[PDB]
Amino acid sequence: NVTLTAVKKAFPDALTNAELVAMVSKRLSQFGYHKYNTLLATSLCSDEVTRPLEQDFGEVYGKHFTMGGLAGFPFGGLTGFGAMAGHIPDGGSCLLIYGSHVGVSWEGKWGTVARRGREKGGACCGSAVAAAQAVTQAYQATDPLDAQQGYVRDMLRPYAATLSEAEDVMVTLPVSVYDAQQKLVTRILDEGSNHIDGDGQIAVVGGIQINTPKEMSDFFVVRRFCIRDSSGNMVENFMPL
Amino acid sequence: TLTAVKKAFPDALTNAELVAMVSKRLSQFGYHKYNTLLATSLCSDEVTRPLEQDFGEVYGKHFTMGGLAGFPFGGLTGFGAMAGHIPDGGSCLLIYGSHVGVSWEGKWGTVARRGREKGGACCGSAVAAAQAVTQAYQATDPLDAQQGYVRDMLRPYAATLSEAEDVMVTLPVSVYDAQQKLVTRILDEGSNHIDGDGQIAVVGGIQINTPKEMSDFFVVRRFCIRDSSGNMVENFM
Ligand SMILES: [Zn+2]
Ligand SMILES: [Zn+2]
């Protein structure tokens, strides 16, 4: 269909949720990640359409720790990571799944997707799109109440030039949000490596979550898939797929 | 464990009791599965997930507003986003709360965790924030911003926490009070995003996390309905 063709034109390497979970769990099983000894953590957007990915991994690794917030940034931060690390089964490891997301419609249009019970779905990712509008308009001019969305604007500001010049800003936006996210994730992992001990590891899957209409499988574009030791050193890199 | 729970919180409900009671009441006000968006503000901690799953079985996939210690860190933008996802002519149901672990031995502030000899603190975030604000009291950047906000919101409770006979049973009550103030502010400020006959139903309280082979509990402190104007239409407490 139009939607699937659109998805694979923008991201030829995109996997279905089912393909992703099968691939990740199979690979990690060879490195001793099983259900009993793995704590799943996610950093995905607040938006309810991102839940299926959490459910799909949760079927394999159980109830997850949530690090995310608006646009999928790991707002739980250093304290959240340390808390999570203190929950890892003894002698076990963590698996962190993070990413931006974007909707694609029945017409193959990016930045929006039909939502249950609504005639108009609005923006997807709403947070990222609003932040994009704010930073690009500021550019083209060449308190916890709302603090998170403030941070999203802050982290997207370096991409303002990139966004304004983009052929399709709605495909470029989630790529930019992912790049901003992966930098923050790296920093948290570097700062929090003290919380992982001995042969404990952290496996990381990062990329772009693609939300399609409910009658269709969602997709995920993997950009990072690797394993880090307790010292913070990369031990395995599974990219490219 | 159960004795300890009812000792401190005599009105505690099991998760099952809670979901049955809430869904039964809201069905009388036209809340069903197709026309309700569920939103939660619960702690990041993986032990709070069962409550979301139990409500999720009734109302579907949920919007998350929460963060460390269960504070609605999604804030105004998060609420507005969520409101724009509500089924046409429908409503939202927001479930929020602090949480606390209680152990096999009936000790507050900790609960055995899957695969671990030692469970550590529960709520971890809240306990660490309580330590920081009490010690600072008794002395009469997104990287870690969220925990900074938890400390900020707990600071008014410093005296209460320092004078508590058991700070671990008192802490989730203070955190709930801090949360309910922020939730009310968000709902007041974001009232514009609810239109027409649309409503916001709110359930707030203290989530009690017990060992895995035991039902979790919830202490309801708030259960009410708000209209699109932000006025309270029903109070079930
Ligand atoms: Zn989003
Ligand atoms: Zn907690």
Task: Give backbone dihedrals phi and psi of A189, rounded to 5 degrees, phi first.
Answer: -65, -40
DSSP A43: E
Task: Assess contact for A50 and A73: CB atoms under 8 A.
Answer: no
What is the residue range of B199's domain? 1-237
CB atoms near residue A33 (< 10 Å): 21
Chain breaks in chain B (C to N over 2.5 A) after: 140
A-B contacts at Cβ under 8 angstroms:
169
User: Can you tell me which residue has the tokens 């947070």?
Assistant: A127
Separation in Å, CA B222 to CA B61, B109, B165, B179: 23, 22, 25, 12
How was this structure obtained? X-ray
> What is the three-class DSSP state of A158?
helix
Q: Which stretch of DSSP H or E encloses residue A2?
A: helix A2-10
CB atoms near residue B226 (< 10 Å): 23
Contact list, B65 vs chain A (CB under 8 Å): 46
DSSP A89: P
DSSP A90: T
Per the structure, the count of domains in chain A is: 1
| β-strand pairing of A93-103 with A38-43 | parallel
- The answer for residues whose C-beta is within 8 angstroms of residue B167's C-beta and 6 or more apart is B109, B130, B134, B161
Contact list, B124 vs chain A (CB under 8 Å): 83, 86
Angle at which helices A77-85 and B145-154 cross, to 10°: 90
Measured from the alpha carbon of residue A122, the closest ligand is: 1
- The answer for residues whose C-beta is within 8 angstroms of residue B211's C-beta and 6 or more apart is B1, B103, B104, B111, B112
Which sign does the torsion angle of CA B41, B47, B50, B51 carry?
Answer: negative
> What is the three-class DSSP state of A234?
strand
Resolution of the entry in angstroms:
1.8
> What is the three-class DSSP state of A82?
helix
Give B222's strand partners.
B204
What is the Cβ-side half-sphere exposure of residue B167, based on CA atoms within 13 angstroms? Answer: 17
CB atoms near residue B181 (< 10 Å): 12
CB contact under 8 A, B81 and A127: yes
What's the CA gap between A169 and A132, in Å, rounded?
Answer: 9
Separation in Å, CA B139 to CA B37, B128, B136, B147, B154: 46, 17, 5, 21, 16
Contact list, B64 vs chain A (CB under 8 Å): 46, 48, 66, 68
Query: Following CA atoms A11, A17, A20, A26 in sequence, which dihedral angle do they give, to the nearest 10 degrees?
Result: -170
Give B121's strand partners.
B110
What's the CA gap between B22 and B40, in Å, rounded?
Answer: 14
Task: Assess contact for B219 and B237: CB atoms under 8 A.
Answer: no
* Preferred mutation among B40, B62, B73 to probe A, highest tally of A CBs within 10 A: B73
Radius of gyration of chain B (CA): 18
Separation in Å, CA B7 to CA A239, B101, B108, B126, B174: 54, 15, 12, 22, 18
Three-class secondary structure assignment of chain B: CHHHHHHHCCCCEEHHHHHHHHHHHHHCCCCCCCCEEEEEECECCHHHHHHHHHHHHHHCCCEECCEHHHCCCCHHHHHHHHHCCCCCCCEEEEEEEEEEEECCCCCECECCCCCCCCCCECCHHHHHHHHHHHHHHHCCCHHHHHHHHHHHHHHHHHHHHHHCCCHHHHHHHHHHHHHHHHHHHHHHHCHHHCCCCCCEEEEEEEEEECCCCCCCEEEEEEEEEECCCCCEEEECC
Task: Assess contact for A37 and A203: CB atoms under 8 A.
Answer: no
What is the Cβ-side half-sphere exposure of residue A94, based on CA atoms within 13 angstroms? Answer: 30
Q: What share of chain A is helix, strand, coil (3-state, %, to 5)?
A: 45, 20, 35
Pinpoint the alpha helices (H) of A141-219. 147-156, 160-165, 169-191
What's the CA gap between B15 and B202, in Å, rounded?
Answer: 16
| β-strand pairing of A15-16 with A219-228 | antiparallel
> What is the three-class DSSP state of A186?
helix
A171: tokens are 């495909």
Contact list, B146 vs chain A (CB under 8 Å): 75-77, 79-80
CB contact under 8 A, B77 and A47: no
Query: Following CA atoms B195, B196, B198, B203 in sequence, which dihedral angle do they give, to the nearest 10 degrees?
Result: 70
Q: How far is the CA of A172 from the centre of ligand 1 (A)?
A: 15
Task: Assess contact for A196 and A230: CB atoms under 8 A.
Answer: yes
What's the CA gap between A237 and A159, in Å, rounded?
Answer: 27
Task: Give backbone dihedrals phi and psi of A94, rounded to 5 degrees, phi first.
Answer: -110, 150
Measured from the alpha carbon of residue B129, the closest ligand is: 2
B187: tokens are 């709902």
B21: tokens are 């009671």
Short-list B186, B148, B156, B187, CA closest to B174:
B156
What's the CA gap between B57 and B49, in Å, rounded?
Answer: 12
| β-strand pairing of A234-237 with A93-103 | unpaired
Which of B44, B50, B62 is the closest to A67 by Cβ? B44
> What is the three-class DSSP state of A166?
coil
CB contact under 8 A, A75 and B125: no
CB atoms near residue B125 (< 10 Å): 29
Task: Assess contact for A99 and A209: CB atoms under 8 A.
Answer: yes
Task: Assess contact for A177 and A111: CB atoms under 8 A.
Answer: no
Nearest-CA distance from A147 to chain B in Å?
7
What is the Cβ-side half-sphere exposure of residue A197, based on CA atoms within 13 angstroms? Answer: 8
B201: tokens are 């139903």
What's the CA gap between B182 and B222, in Å, rounded?
Answer: 14
Instruction: Outline where DSSP puts E strands in chain A.
Output: 15-16, 38-43, 65-66, 93-103, 202-211, 219-228, 234-237
User: Can you tell me which residue has the tokens 């690979």?
Assistant: A27
Task: Give backbone dihedrals phi and psi of B205, rounded to 5 degrees, phi first.
Answer: 175, -150
> What is the three-class DSSP state of A236?
strand
Query: Following CA atoms A161, A162, A164, A166 in sequence, which dihedral angle do they give, to the nearest 10 degrees?
Result: 160
Short-list A209, A240, A198, A157, CA closest to A48:
A209
CB contact under 8 A, B88 and A118: yes
